[PDB]
Amino acid sequence: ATFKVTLINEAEGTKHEIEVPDDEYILDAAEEQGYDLPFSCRAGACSTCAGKLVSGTVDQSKQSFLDDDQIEAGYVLTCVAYPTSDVVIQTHKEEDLY
Numbered sequence: 001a002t003f004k005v006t007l008i009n010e011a012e013g014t015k016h017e018i019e020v021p022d023d024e025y026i027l028d029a030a031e032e033q034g035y036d037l038p039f040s041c042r043a044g045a046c047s048t049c050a051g052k053l054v055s056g057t058v059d060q061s062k063q064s065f066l067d068d069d070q071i072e073a074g075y076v077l078t079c080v081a082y083p084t085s086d087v088v089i090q091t092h093k094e095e096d097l098y
């Protein structure tokens with residue numbers, strides 16, 4: 001499968017559409033497709049690459065930073081998240097945690 005991923009940057013009012021394989025992390029695909037996104041650890045242990053789901057789902061089982069409540073609230077670590085449906089996500093959401 002290949003999923004459609006819509007990247008929305010609310011602060012800058014930008015929107016990017018990318019296609020991501022079901023076995024590729026969102027971050028990687030974005031970069032390959034020409035859209036640089038924030039990151040630091042690239043290992044699911046920080047909050048630099050955080051995004052917030054608008055719609056769709058993902059598999060971010062490799063993540064270790066977010067707690068259950070943050071996950072329920074829709075936050076995703078883009079560096080270790082695989083899309084599991086078409087997804088709409090707001091990027092650059094780190095500041096939202098604090």
Ligand code: FES
Nearest residue numbers: 040042044046079
């Ligand atoms: S860059 Fe650290 S969790 Fe994604």
